[PDB]
Amino acid sequence: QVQLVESGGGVVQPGRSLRLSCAASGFPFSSYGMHWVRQAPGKGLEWVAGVSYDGSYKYYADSVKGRFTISRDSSKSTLYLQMNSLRPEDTAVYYCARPSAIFGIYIILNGLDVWGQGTTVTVSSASTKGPSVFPLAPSSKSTSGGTAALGCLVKDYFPEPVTVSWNSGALTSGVHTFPAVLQSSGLYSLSSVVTVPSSSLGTQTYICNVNHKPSNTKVDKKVEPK
Amino acid sequence: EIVLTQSPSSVSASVGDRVTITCRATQGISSWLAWYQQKPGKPPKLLIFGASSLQSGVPSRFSGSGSGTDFTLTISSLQPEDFATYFCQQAHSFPLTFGGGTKVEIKRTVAAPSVFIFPPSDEQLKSGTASVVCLLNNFYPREAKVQWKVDNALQSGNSQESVTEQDSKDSTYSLSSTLTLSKADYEKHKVYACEVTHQGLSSPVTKSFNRGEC
């Protein structure tokens, strides 16, 4: 009922601009102050900007002063965050948040009642690139055995994310798809692994399905022992 | 600028346990401290404001206390849906400030990792770069040390690590380590090894292959 809908995120090269939007519904919008909060991947929460209910007073973190501009539109019940001179340090998921009232009293400084779903901002000089997919072949140092491990190296793609399934979804037990790491080149790389019984090798085929929609890339890599 | 310091950074507990998280401020914030809950992929969720006032709908097992500089969040009996990250927030003054966060994890018995090493594929070798991957599978607790060695030479600055969350069925972790070399460097040496130090191991486990077909 009461919710904040966000939009405007995306991938942008360093030094460019972006404008975030937060549309409110279900509550009196222009009675509340409003805040923008961001959270870098793996990091914690950081407040970036706030504005009073009437738009007369605006507050900024030191990290964004002179660069970010907060504003609001009462007719549209919409909150804005104009972000200029973006740098990779600004890569995060951005939220709009509403300070909680205390028994009818609207205070801009309180715990944050309601949060938007978030919109992701990526600041990178990298260009869209499909992943290279390499097999992590299962091994042996005898002929028979117990449980074997095989996997899929999804390397050098941009931007996030890639989806990985095994045998078109028929293989889910023992699967670990690891979070991507950001390499020095600016491209991402992750690996998906699965543990199988050693009797399966040779009899059962293992196919790793990698989809990267930003580049319309779809790869089916069969992983067999060398 | 007021800075908040949460303690501890993480805690492992079982369902039914009593968990106590503290938040310390560099200045006095009277009673303008809020507590949040966050699960991966979702926005934060307010639990406490005014340092003791429960949000509407939040279970009564969540209690907040304290004033001035020292504060405390308490969960009187942990429930399965309470394993998440918890943040304190200061609302005494601008700028608004969050604590580093406290992650409450599922406690279980020690589990030693299964270690696997994977040589680079021949398809990648044609591109001019080689990636050796090492897998640590289903271990607990999370603390582990992976050291790469090539011809017994300890590597530095050419590897990256990635860890999953606790598995939904056995509460263990898994870890992937990727050593990245140039093909010329890779063909220049023979034995590639992955050394794993974990408290479930009496001695470090090393897995190794040697380049060729061995």
Residue numbers in the entry:
A (entry chain A): 1 to 226
B (entry chain B): 1 to 214
Give sentences from the paper.
Here, we present structural information for the human antibody PN-SIA28’s heterosubtypic binding of hemagglutinin (HA) from circulating and emerging potential influenza A viruses (IAVs). The globular HA head domain recognizes host proteins bearing sialic acid on their surface, while the HA stem triggers the fusion of viral and host membranes following endocytosis, allowing release of viral contents into the cell. Anti-stem antibodies exhibit much broader cross-subtype neutralizing activity in vitro and in vivo by inhibiting the low pH-induced HA conformational rearrangement, hence blocking membrane fusion.
We determined the structures of the PN-SIA28 Fab fragment alone at 2.5 Å and of its Fab variable fragment complexes with H1, H14, or H18 HA at 3.2, 3.4, and 2.6 Å resolution, respectively. The high-resolution structures of the PN-SIA28 Fab alone and PN-SIA28 Fab variable fragment in complex with H18 HA allow us to analyze conformational changes of PN-SIA28 upon HA binding in detail. The structural alignment of PN-SIA28 and PN-SIA28/H18 reveal that their CDR conformations are almost identical, except for CDRH3. The CDRH3 loop formed by residues 97-100 G undergoes a largely rigid-body rotation, pivoted around S96 (CDRH3) and L100H (CDRH3) to facilitate interactions with HA. Additionally, the side chain of F103 (CDRH3) moves by 4.5 Å to fit into the hydrophobic groove of the epitope. The structural characterization of PN-SIA28 bound and unbound structures highlights its long and flexible CDRH3, which can accommodate the differences in conformation and environment in the hydrophobic grove of the HA. Given that the CDRL conformations in PN-SIA28 bound and unbound structures are almost the same and CDRLs in PN-SIA28/HA complexes only interact with Helix A of different HAs, the different Helix A orientations in different HAs cause them bind to different CDRLs.
